[PDB]
Paper text:
In summary, we solved the 3.3 Å structure of respiratory complex III from the hyperthermophilic chemoautotrophic ϵ‐proteobacterium [name] and revealed the structural basis for the hyperstability of proteins in an extreme thermal environment. The two cyt. b protomers bind to each other mainly through TMH1 and TMH4 to form a stable dimer.
1 complex from A. aeolicus has been shown to use a 1,4‐naphthoquinone (NQ), as a special substrate, to mediate electron transfer.9a In our cryo‐EM structure, several NQ molecules can be clearly traced in both the Qi site and on the cytoplasmic side, but none are around the Qo site. The tail of the 1,4‐naphthoquinone stretches towards the membrane core outside of the binding pocket without interacting with cyt. b. Importantly, Arg222 residue is replaced by a histidine in R. sphaeroides and B. taurus. Compared with the short histidine residue, the positively charged side chain of Arg222 is closer to the oxygen atom of NQ. We find that a residue unique to the thermophiles, Tyr61 of cyt. b, is involved in this dimer interaction. The phenyl‐hydroxy of Tyr61 in TMH1 of one protomer binds to the nitrogen atom of Arg197 in TMH4 of another protomer enhancing the interactions between the two cyt. b protomers.
Numbering used by the authors:
A (entry chain E), D (entry chain B): 7 to 401
B (entry chain A), F (entry chain D): 8 to 75, 96 to 121, 131 to 170
C (entry chain F), E (entry chain C): 3 to 238
The structure:
């Protein structure tokens, strides 16, 4: 029964405290589902990678003979669990982008949520590495070369800068770090496999746990902006169960329907067809831009004429998210409450979608001009947050 | 004192453990640099003869010619990364040297004379120490 | 209301972003090759029976091992270079694992799959006249269908000089005075498709189960929604 | 500083509640360290397996060429992290045996700790599989054959029993389950590798977390036996910090010293020398008994003349630990309070050490007689717990 | 006290259990072979210099490649069967990875390590007279030292008929009228030891760091103990 | 009804997901049984001739002899797992058949006549269906 487990585990005292008397806000909108959806996609990736690790082999002469021959034809339902994996990777990138952007919107990074945003940025940085190093593994014609392209980006740092041209042969993230040093060999493939498969998901679970605890410790920020009305204002909370637990439970099922649509009926873009060719280190494909979640940065890169300054802009665009809680400082919180932050956020969103879309097209001079025009608008959102902050402080 | 001695000792232990972990995982040390020396004695290659080698990856040529793109002027000894351009074949020596996959021709300095490939072979860096090319 | 404008903007932009990011990016100019339409039914159903009790896939397999196995080694089906015949062991190909080709979902005990490193060391490292004469090894036709497409595979074979400017692969099926080559190339492409594409029994089970899974999750979501709506009435 | 992190994460409110005002018992003895030591050894195994997964390769033609050539000679400090791994596996078995046996001693399985013992038995069962499937991986001369010996044990079940001889070709844990079916091939090695390396440690972390929560939910059982004196009896708790947190912190360091002794100076029994020969499926080694943590059961096996009944005894000796909380029922708790349970526990401990020691010697008829005499004493401890329980109920 | 009897029983039994379970189980009767004591210094220090500027390990390597590489393929050092010489490529052994033998902690660019499946398919599957005449392939002497011991390796070689009753491996160094064979076999065993045992520089660094780690953890434990003792006095 | 319809639906979904997971991970189905049939036509083997095959693993012999351990009496067709005993070599046919590694001899029924091996070759099970051995 349940009373026997109740007396020994206190299951009902945990249930009545975590669900029935939690008292989340009532006016929670739809983009407050993206965290639960990212957690569900993380679970999907773990469950479907536990199946792939049984048959994938981190050898150069055996990779792409496991993931393409064994996984796809030899193993029952192996096609399905590679489809689920390669679809959930892209869905997990997209849901995390939506989550962090509609957390930027409601400004869920202000007091006292400065630390949850730092842990979330660590989540994002290590997720980039988990989805970047897991793409070399199929060892396809463009997988190898998109790993090479992405691992030579830290090499433009060593190129002679405008100032102090001693950066040559220093911070060698090429030789020491990934690409293994002058050759991508079997040892490097095994190292990337092991890291991607067990070192990164463990520090993903740890950081997701810390993040979920820090969300509860600071409380869900309501989208209105008053951020609380303590000891008063009832009839606007309608506690967690069953108001929210069944709304999220329906959004999760509908999201899984949209997910298993791509898994079954349209995967010709998650398993790209010209990646089904075994990689040879002598023939370079034509269009070898990195994966879609890194194209918004790859367009800021290789658009500035200097490569060192392009890499510096690449890194500044990623560092301006750690400082983003420390960068915007105002008593006002939401975007329903800041009419000047809404226009900057829409500029940021549009000009950040446009960068990822320009990152797919071939590098023409007009494409470079457009990617620079949009990079200027992306940087404007960060170099104007303190201005709007200083304006709103004077009301 | 103890409440700081244990802190210093734990810090030294953590530093050593992190050093070991880095040395195992993140270190292709002294085996990735294969090869930055690439001893290639110049007095062994004959005129109008190419020696196949490997520098910073595969592959590399060692061309020597007595007389005469064109990045460098007459030095008579140099090295070009030998892999065809537009589809990545290996050109054979012999006076131009071509690759028989598609028909791409190459002058001993890298440029193309009959080009299926769009661009010539990029010259990798080099150093001259007596009779040894890098 | 203004919230509605916010909704159909912040959702419309995301939908039209993921649309042209995940299918039909209209700004990429990759070219398209198509089957000659002369037959276009040899390739649609490679498992379609014909006379002499042979399907099109089996006949394409024989055409491939007879006219194409002299330089190309289609593994994943046990086809290797005919020099020597067969290029794998000779003697014990079973003592390699080396397992018999067990694709979806039926195994073929008469053909074996040899790893990429065991092969090309026993076979092509006692090098025969392929890398020497041609210049490049005819790479592999195992997963070339999934990587090129039926259109590119058909338009490449029977006219390699048009798709690629210069290529030491011959015409080897010359049309415009041999009217019997187009269907041969179609059978070859249909065979190469039958190695990487599920049969009509398996490609249908996947469709049925993928429809049932989506119809399962949609119904489960709407059932949970109706349950929440009903439970919020007993309380308020 | 710390106040900034305090305001956003509530770190001091967690510290003062989990350490300073926890109020554990004061009279806790030494064998109450084995849980913390098993947790530390679990951490050691995870940390040192994250390094080994980078270079181990789950192919028949490449296994024992990674773990013996690459790991040991090619990789810097790889010898050290294979030594730590193969030593921590045996230390993790030994510490878990000590923990569960000195938890049997103080009867930490009675009310209300029935569920923590079930979760602990699940820990033990899945730990057997994690240490059993991880031993096939080096692919040594005796590793392969000790996997074969252990996976043919469920095959004696199919042998014609005394009753209902239809068990032939049913419950085929040989073909379906491990050994892959009639051949240990490359696919089976890859499957065992993937499972051992990521599927078993994940359900180890989950179960260890559930176990640690269930220990707190039921409270530490004090070794005396009164099990509490609620609302009274002060001056005998001396709360968790710094009374216990620094006693455990010193025992952990001394245990790690004893551990790194074996890691560096004596490992000729954790990496057995005749396991450094590449496995061939045609030559069987002489003495191929399973690993030491399974020898106490392997001696109950292959000592009874019947193989089916030997396997049934193997399984009953393992099932009599799940029922052990439900098997012993008495108001008295400790072994300092039950003078009749102490003698049965010492019989159990001695006759269970003797079984693992007899499991190493070759199978002579005298060895079989001794292993049966000791198996009788092991079963006596389980078929007498209800008798002592019924006697003590009448006081 | 009675608690003391409980302590030195429940700890004594566990200690004497793990003793004869983890080192020197006195009830296992595995036999022991020992070096003939004729030299016993050729094998103790294989890196010990000799005349002609050659160490004993290098001389054992030459003796092995000259008299033993005709049937045994000691990989992990680049030694393969001399038929053909060398049995690996011939031509491109570099295009296999195939990497140069990089042991602890110095690499040898003149010898290459070829995987087990690439080898024995290029080499022994164009089978020469080893599996036919002998009956079994001379397995491998790469990690035979770690698996047998110096005593077993010495007593096996120069008298294989004594260790194993019948074995098609010859004496190949016959004593009792050739007094120059014992030191040759000792040099061979010393070479085979130098492939799997750290040099005197590396086997010493491991000892020093293993002493320092234990002395670190013991001191840390006793420091934490003294800190707890001191902190329990400020409170009580 | 809904509060039980969702329970039944979730149970069916969990059952299907567990079926898929089992079918991928824990199933060597229909490929592990290689081979339990092992078609060996008796009318192809000649008298005093042995055919090398594999049953339940490697290896297996197919011995046929016209006239005459000894588990079975005269059947003239049977199968023995052919791998030497004390060190695991492969005996060669030819009238006894021995293995040349150590000199172990074997009678066509399995027993040893000059034994370096301690025990003979264990007879694997067999079935007779017309002219096909299992
Ligand atoms: C068969 C089916 C096919 C399926 C096709 C694929 C599926 C597509 C579905 C995706 C739909 C996403 C919906 C998100 C929007 C939710 C609704 C909304 O409108 O979200 C708004 C903000 O959310 C927010 O920022 C979040 C929205 C902004 C996020 C921008 C995402 C950019 C994507 C990545 C960009 C690359 C980044 C590069 C690195 C810098 C809410 O603003 P409010 O002022 O509170 O309005 C209140 C009203 O809603 C009252 O009801
Ligand atoms: C260089 C250095 C070399 C190192 C060599 C290796 C290291 C060895 C160290 C191991 C020492 C272990 C110490 C355990 C004993 C702790 C002390 C003790 O005595 O533990 C007793 C009980 O613990 C208990 O059951 C626990 C004891 C019983 C556990 C039995 C373990 C059996 C092992 C596995 C058996 C195989 C099982 C097979 C499957 C059935 C405590 O009983 P009390 O009545 O409360 O006494 C109170 C007094 O102590 C007051 O102070
Ligand atoms: C997926 C399969 C499941 C199995 C997974 C196993 C792991 C965990 C099991 C699941 C957890 C069980 C749920 C227990 C929740 C009950 C906690 C609780 O509710 O107890 C609270 C204590 O919380 C407290 O100390 C908080 C204690 C500190 C929490 C620290 C843990 C967070 C980090 C964990 C993530 C890993 C990373 C670790 C590295 C740092 C009491 O509340 P208070 O604030 O003190 O009182 C104030 C009142 O006004 C409100 O109540
Ligand atoms: C450094 C020293 C290395 C030698 C120093 C240098 C000059 C010598 C030079 C040197 C020596 C060689 O033998 C060597 C061999 C092969 C190639 C190269 C070399 C070499 O260059 C010893 C390092 C090994 C120790 C044993 C680390 C243990 C391995 C891991 C398993 C530990 C993981 C640590 C985690 C991340 C923290 C967890 C904290 C937890 C709460 C416990 C706290 C205890 C303590 C850590 C404070
Ligand atoms: C069954 C059905 C399979 C077909 C049924 C049979 C006859 C058809 C026969 C059949 C069809 C083939 O196409 C096929 C192909 C190749 C070889 C053989 C076959 C075959 O034999 C679909 C199974 C696939 C579904 C898509 C499972 C999803 C895969 C995992 C990633 C899910 C992991 C589930 C975990 C363990 C529970 C987590 C619960 C969490 C809270 C969410 C709850 C949502 C829901 C699970 C209730
Ligand atoms: C004369 C030897 C030879 C013959 C015979 C041959 N091939 Fe080729 N194949 C080649 C060469 C050379 C290339 C060029 C490789 C390249 O351009 O990268 C090639 C390339 C290809 C490609 C891939 C080209 C690309 O860019 O994707 C395909 C597909 C192909 N051949 C199909 C076939 C088929 C089908 C047959 C049998 C009907 C065949 N070939 C017979 C040698 C041959
Ligand atoms: C006549 C061919 C031949 C020659 C030459 C040869 N071996 Fe052997 N080796 C064999 C055979 C046959 C065996 C038997 C394998 C077995 O019994 O399992 C063997 C076995 C061995 C073994 C392992 C035996 C065991 O049971 O562990 C070692 C070690 C060994 N030989 C060493 C050497 C050395 C060192 C040399 C060179 C001095 C050498 N052999 C030369 C063929 C040869
Ligand atoms: C958590 C977020 C993760 C992301 C975003 C991610 C991403 C990816 C991607 C993009 C691929 C390429 C697949 C393809 O191109 O077909 C991949 C492959 C792979 N992933 Fe992950 N991964 C994640 C976690 C995991 C986990 C937890 C495992 C656990 C085993 C895992 C195991 C694997 C394996 C073995 C492969 C190679 C198999 C194959 O290529 O088919 N991954 N991953
Ligand atoms: C695996 C990845 C992630 C998981 C599982 C996850 C999970 C969650 C969940 C469940 C919530 C609460 C529900 C909600 O707010 O929708 C949340 C909140 C939050 N997350 Fe994440 N998240 C992830 C990634 C990220 C990233 C990458 C960032 C930032 C770069 C981030 C920043 C935040 C913030 C600021 C909040 C607070 C929302 C608020 O208070 O309104 N998260 N996260
Ligand atoms: C948690 C308890 C675990 C136990 C008791 C255990 C046990 C073992 C054992 C006995 C071996 C054999 C090593 C040898 O004989 O030299 C081994 C190897 C291995 N373990 Fe574990 N293991 C555990 C967890 C893990 C984890 C978490 C990982 C994560 C990567 C892992 C990865 C490996 C790998 C890759 C090998 C093969 C490497 C080699 O053989 O040198 N193990 N394990
Ligand atoms: C990875 C394996 C394990 C870990 C990390 C672990 C951890 C712990 C810890 C830290 C404690 C509290 C401290 C202590 O009692 O010493 C505990 C208590 C306990 N454990 Fe475990 N344990 C493990 C395995 C087991 C096993 C295999 C069993 C039983 C078969 C078990 C049964 C118990 C019981 C009954 C208690 C309660 C002790 C009491 O209340 O006095 N544990 N465990
Ligand atoms: S590959 Fe050299 S010409 Fe195309
Ligand atoms: S192998 Fe046949 S006698 Fe030892």
């Amino acid at each position: 029964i349940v009373d026997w487990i109740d007396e020994r585990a206190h299951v009902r005292e945990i249930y009545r405290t975590q669900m029935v008397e939690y008292k989340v806000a009532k006016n929670l909108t739809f983009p407050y589902v993206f965290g639960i959806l990212a957690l569900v996609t993380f679970a999907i990736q773990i469950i479907s990678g536990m199946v792939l690790i049984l048959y994938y082999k981190p050898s150069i002469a055996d990779a792409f003979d496991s993931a393409t021959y064994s996984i796809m034809g030899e193993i029952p339902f192996g096609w399905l669990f590679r489809h689920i994996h390669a679809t959930g990777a892209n869905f997990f990138m997209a849901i995390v982008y939506l989550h962090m952007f509609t957390g930027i919107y409601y400004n869920a990074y202000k007091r006292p949520r400065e630390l949850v945003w730092i842990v979330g940025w660590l989540i994002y940085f290590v997720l980039i590495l988990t989805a970047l190093s897991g793409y070399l593994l199929p060892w396809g014609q463009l997988s190898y070369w998109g790993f090479i392209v992405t691992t030579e980006i830290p090499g433009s740092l060593a190129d002679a800068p405008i100032l102090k041209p001693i950066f040559k042969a220093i911070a060698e993230t090429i030789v020491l770090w990934m690409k293994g040093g002058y050759v991508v060999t079997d040892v490097t493939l095994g190292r990337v496999f092991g890291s991607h498969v067990l070192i990164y998901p463990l520090i993903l679970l740890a950081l997701v746990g810390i993040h979920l605890y820090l969300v509860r410790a600071a409380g869900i920020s309501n989208p209105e902006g008053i951020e609380y009305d303590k000891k008063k204002n009832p009839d606007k909370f309608v506690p967690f169960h069953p108001y929210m637990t069944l709304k999220e439970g329906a959004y999760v099922m509908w999201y899984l329907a949209v997910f298993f649509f791509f898994v079954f009926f349209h995967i010709s873009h998650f398993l790209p067809p010209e990646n089904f060719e075994p990689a040879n280190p002598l023939k370079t494909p034509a269009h070898i831009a990195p994966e879609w979640y890194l194209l918004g940065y790859y367009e800021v890169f290789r658009s500035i004429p200097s490569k060192f300054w392009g890499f510096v802009a690449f890194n500044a665009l990623l560092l301006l998210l750690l400082l983003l809680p420390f960068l915007d400082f105002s008593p006002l919180k939401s975007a329903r409450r800041r009419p000047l932050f809404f226009v900057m956020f829409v500029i940021f969103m549009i000009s950040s979608m446009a960068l990822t879309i320009l990152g797919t097209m071939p590098p023409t001079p007009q494409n470079a001009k457009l990617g620079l025009i949009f990079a200027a608008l992306v940087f404007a959102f960060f170099i104007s947050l303190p201005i709007i902050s200083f304006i709103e402080y004077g009301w | 004192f103890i409440s700081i001695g244990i802190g210093a000792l734990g810090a030294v232990g953590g530093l050593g453990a992190l050093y070991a972990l880095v040395r195992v995982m993140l270190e292709p040390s002294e085996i990735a640099a294969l090869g930055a020396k690439t001893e290639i004695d110049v007095s062994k290659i004959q005129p109008m003869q190419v020696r196949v080698t490997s520098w910073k990856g595969k592959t590399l040529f060692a061309i020597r010619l007595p007389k005469d793109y064109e990045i460098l002027k007459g030095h008579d000894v140099f090295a070009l990364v030998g892999v065809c351009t537009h589809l990545g074949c290996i050109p054979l020596w012999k006076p131009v040297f071509h690759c028989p996959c598609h028909g791409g021709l190459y002058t001993p300095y890298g440029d193309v004379i009959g080009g299926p490939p769009p661009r010539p072979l990029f010259i990798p860096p080099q150093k001259l120490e007596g009779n040894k090319l890098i | 209301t203004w919230g509605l404008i916010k909704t159909i903007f912040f959702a419309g932009s995301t939908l039209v972003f993921f649309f042209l990011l995940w299918f039909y990016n209209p700004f990429k100019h990759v070219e398209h090759y198509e089957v000659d339409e002369e037959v276009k039914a040899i390739i649609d159903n490679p498992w379609k029976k014909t006379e002499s009790g042979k399907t099109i896939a089996e006949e394409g397999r024989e055409l491939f091992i007879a006219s194409c196995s002299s330089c190309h080694s289609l593994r994943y089906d046990g086809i290797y270079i005919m020099s020597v015949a067969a290029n794998p062991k000779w003697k014990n190909i079973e003592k390699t694992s080396g397992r018999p080709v067990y694709r979806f979902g039926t195994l073929y005990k008469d053909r074996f799959f040899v790893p990429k490193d065991v092969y090309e060391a026993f076979a092509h490292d006692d090098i025969q006249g392929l890398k020497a004469s041609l210049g490049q090894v005819p790479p592999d036709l195992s997963s070339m269908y999934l990587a090129r497409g039926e259109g590119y595979l058909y338009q490449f074979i029977l006219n390699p000089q048009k798709v690629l400017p210069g290529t030491t692969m011959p015409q080897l099926f010359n049309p415009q005075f041999d009217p019997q080559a187009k269907e041969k190339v179609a059978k070859i492409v249909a065979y190469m498709k039958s190695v990487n594409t599920p049969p009509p029994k398996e490609s249908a089970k996947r469709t049925v189960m993928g429809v049932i899974v989506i119809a399962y999750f949609i119904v489960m979501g709407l059932l949970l929604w109706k349950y929440r709506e009903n439970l919020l009435k007993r309380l308020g």
